[PDB]
Design a protein around this ligand. Structure first.
Ligand code: FDA
Ligand code: FDA
Lengths: 378, 378
């Protein structure tokens, strides 16, 4: 559709991601939604295929080419299964990213290759029960006691919380310094004191494990400090562009899957003597869905090209995320409507798309936060 | 809020419906959604309280006062549990209605009192796998053989399909007459040949049993013809005003429940140093939710007053249904957004409201059909 605008590598990566999604994700997404569980074997396949190392340079064991290819791979994965896309976005951007940005050679050597291959899935632990959008108002603490960082507190909504091998954890080390008193820590998820609760019950992306985690004298070595002491907030904000490009692409992929079901259904479902695709009201909906999907893709790819070249792109990534997420609810709602009563049945799957899409306006910065960011830079 | 505009009876009925919903529906709605099942004991309580006879005159065993009181009772029930509201709307309008409109004295004597008290729940069987919005294109047949109407065919999406004691069933009796060749039948649901399939798996109103029903030489007495032969289509269209007023009120009630959770959450959840109700963006959302809810209520009550006086009100009821259903998705989406990440969790219940609300744009005539009807009468 847009292909002559893509390099051969980008096309190749897009094609491999789609073949994997068509074969391994789309037929099983309904089952995983019902089970609220993603098989470990599927995660391992995303790993083997290089989809969990797309932000890490090849020389360090990853599969980075450019951010356009990542955005393309993410759209295809999301179109197959939204929960896999969540897993993938978080693991790439806020699992690998911070270690790549701020890890020492020893830390990178221990972690990057394994994470990039998906042998070790990463989690990012910043949000707390009382603190989401105001991400700097933290109450989990870390104090250096007996040559160890000892963490105490509680994190909320940890994506990959059960399956993660390592957690990037943000805790207050120097209370009197406020926003400049937070630090980042690498915490093996088998460390005594690292207590993972039951996955939350959610409306959608039900197979993406999302867990509360409690830290009860969670003791790690002194060298598991990530970055400099007090640098925690910078580090927590250092991968917003990749994070938003990824979720924007996830929104795009979910919307697209629902649109593809609706176009198909419309060309086959006859009502009042014609396929319903021929009724003006359906035509109109389909046209609007295509427009919004294409506009979202272009926004995402724009932000991705900027990021590839190391250019400023926070606003552009936040626009993509905002637009893609809000349109995906609309596209998915119309997809349901085009199916009539069948749209509301679990068997027709557009209802799952609608449920999964809705989370994209909330995480990776709420729509309200995206607006603040875009406006503040005008 | 609006109370001085209501009669004392209307207020009394509203108050009793709300007390019942607060006590018996709202605490259990989450459980019934999870079980995809409405207890028989709750249905029987809706019966005892008079909520299942609100369209039938008191002298015939019902509780009819006026349609405003029905609209008020429906909003309160829906605010407690959407699945109960579906059950109630369908039972009142297209269960009792057609027997009241078109039944003989013998048929009314056998059925009305029992249905009005909820001892016998009614189902309405018109839609077929190939025929929804084009409701006159029917293929289930009924042929008078050996002093019996013998029905053969298939109906789709029968609300109350498992729990119904009697079904109003629409079948082709005289093929050569087209739209004027359809007839209506009263079919005890224990009649051999009346084969109820498993409830459908749905995104929401999961506790409202919605079943495919197959008719395999389903044989009933000749006198179970409802109305005159060929009158079936008229009868199927004879309660559209009540049906739409009811679902409009259901949409209204669901939206209102979600709005009430969001206002409450907003006054208690602090973020960036203030209750979030004080942030302009939340204020704006809350204001818009109230406006849409109030406008929907006024549309519903307008249609209800007209119907009470026996005045033409198809357009007005279809406006109410269209507006209330489309706004309810928006109000429920904002309700989720106001809760942030908690909005997506099953425990906070606004996600169930959002799932339940979505069906109101589809059944009781899709939004597209509502628009046709309103436009054709300008
Ligand atoms: C499934 C899932 C997965 C994840 C996460 C959530 C969920 C649901 N998140 C947490 C997520 O980032 C978080 O939910 C959002 O930041 C929103 O914060 P709260 O949930 O605290 O709502 P919060 O209380 O921040 O917001 C409530 C509402 O108020 C609004 N609001 C708040 N402040 C405002 C202001 N100043 N002006 C206007 N409006 C304002 C918001 O827009 C929102 O609509 C996370 N976190 C993490 O650390 N690691 C992870 O892996 C994940 N993953
Ligand atoms: C939970 C539940 C419960 C019930 C029901 C459904 C569900 C999901 N209904 C069936 C319901 O009334 C039905 O789904 C709608 O009439 C829509 O019809 P279809 O599902 O066949 O879609 P249909 O094929 O009619 O429509 C598909 C889409 O095309 C659009 N469309 C169709 N014709 C068009 C035209 N000419 N111009 C523009 N757009 C057009 C529609 O707006 C819709 O968006 C029912 N029925 C019943 O008999 N008894 C019952 O108890 C219930 N209850």
């Amino acid at each position: 559709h847009m292909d002559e605008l893509y390099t051969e590598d980008q096309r190749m990566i897009r094609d491999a991601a789609r073949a994997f999604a068509t074969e391994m994700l789309a037929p099983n997404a309904a089952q995983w939604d019902h089970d609220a569980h993603l098989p470990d074997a599927i995660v391992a396949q995303l790993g083997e295929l290089g989809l969990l190392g797309m932000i890490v340079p090849q020389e360090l064991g990853g599969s980075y080419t450019d951010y356009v290819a990542y955005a393309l791979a993410m759209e295809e994965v999301a179109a197959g299964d939204a929960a896999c896309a969540t897993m993938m976005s978080v693991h790439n951007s806020v699992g690998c990213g911070p270690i790549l940005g701020f890890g020492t050679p020893a830390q990178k050597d221990r972690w990057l290759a394994d994470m990039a291959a998906g042998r070790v899935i990463g989690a990012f632990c910043l949000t707390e029960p009382h603190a989401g959008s105001e991400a700097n108002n933290l109450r989990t603490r870390a104090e250096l006691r007996d040559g160890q960082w000892v963490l105490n507190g509680a994190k909320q909504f940890v994506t990959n919380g059960q399956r993660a091998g390592v957690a990037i954890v943000f805790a207050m080390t120097d209370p009197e310094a406020g926003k400049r008193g937070i630090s980042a820590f690498l915490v093996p998820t088998d460390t005594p004191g690292f207590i993972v609760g039951k996955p939350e019950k959610k409306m959608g992306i039900r197979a993406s494990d999302t867990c509360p985690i409690t830290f009860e004298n969670c003791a790690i070595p002194e060298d598991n400090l990530l970055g400099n002491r007090g640098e925690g907030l910078k580090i927590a904000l250092s991968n917003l562009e990749g994070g938003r490009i990824g979720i924007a692409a996830q929104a795009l992929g979910i919307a697209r899957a629902a649109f593809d079901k609706a176009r198909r259904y419309a060309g086959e479902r006859v009502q009042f003597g014609k396929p319903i695709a021929e009724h003006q009201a359906i035509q109109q909906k389909l046209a609007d869905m295509a427009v919004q999907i294409n506009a979202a893709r272009l926004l995402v790819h724009h932000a991705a090209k900027l990021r590839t070249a190391g250019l400023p792109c926070l606003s552009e990534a936040s626009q993509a995320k905002l637009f893609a997420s809000e349109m995906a609810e609309r596209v998915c709602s119309d997809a349901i409507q085009i199916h009539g009563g069948y749209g509301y049945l679990v068997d027709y799957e557009v209802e799952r798309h609608y449920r999964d899409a809705r989370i994209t306006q909330i995480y990776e910065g709420t729509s309200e936060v995206q607006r603040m960011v875009i406006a503040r830079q005008l």
